[PDB]
Design a protein around this ligand. Structure first.
Ligand SMILES: [Zn+2]
Ligand SMILES: [Zn+2]
Length: 218
């Protein structure tokens, strides 16, 4: 498979945004994920959209950083997020999801995580720190965000729409009534965030939170 994924220039050395692509309904779409380099290996936040690219990403990370992937955190149950966790489980790489996300994975016939996320509590690995937060339902009932306090970056995931999105996208499993309330909680909580990464489309340019509220109103 062609290496068409994009690893962006990192925030303060170790925090990386990476973009992967998938074709759905005759059109190519982008998903933004992240990874964090630590002294004990690399932590993925969500996985390539296409499972055929899992090994490719791991190989690229090994060549770039001389480090293995040592943990995978899913920000919800969908294919562009948790994906197929069996790939990582089979290799003995710890995978992390909330109880809710695991319930969805199991219901959908998919592999579940080997570790259970405690929301709102610091995770520390290889000298790095982050917090996985559940702010409420939105894009899905299980969507969570990831705060990186040393980087002032919030991984919004698919709860946050891109400034470049023209609709809400896949909403069959969304809680549209709760979504703006969850976004307003996010907006109030992460004032220190100088960068918020939306799950899909353009991550550059800011104004993602405000545009999410606009799309919800429309
Ligand atoms: Zn989703
Ligand atoms: Zn998504």
């Amino acid at each position: 498979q062609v290496k068409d994924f994009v690893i962006e220039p990192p925030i303060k050395n170790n925090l990386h945004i990476y973009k992967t692509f998938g074709v759905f309904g005759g059109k190519e779409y982008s998903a933004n994920s992240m990874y964090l380099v630590t002294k004990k290996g690399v932590v993925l936040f969500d996985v390539p959209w296409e499972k055929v690219q899992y090994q490719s990403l791991m190989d690229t990370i090994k060549k770039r950083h001389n480090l293995p992937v040592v943990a995978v955190f899913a920000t919800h149950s969908h294919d562009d997020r948790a994906g197929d966790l069996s790939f990582f489980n089979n290799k003995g790489i710890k995978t992390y999801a909330t109880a809710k996300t695991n319930e969805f994975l199991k219901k959908d016939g998919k592999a579940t995580s080997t570790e259970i996320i405690k929301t709102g509590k610091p995770y520390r690995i290889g000298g790095e720190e982050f917090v996985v937060d559940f702010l409420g339902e939105g894009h899905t009932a299980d969507n969570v965000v990831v705060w990186f306090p040393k980087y002032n970056v919030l991984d919004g995931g698919c709860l946050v729409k891109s400034n470049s999105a023209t609709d809400l996208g896949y909403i069959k499993e969304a809680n549209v009534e709760q979504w703006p309330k969850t976004i307003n909680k996010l907006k109030a909580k992460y004032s220190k965030a100088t960068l918020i990464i939306p799950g899909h489309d353009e991550w550059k340019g800011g104004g993602h939170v405000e545009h999410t509220l606009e799309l919800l109103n429309k």
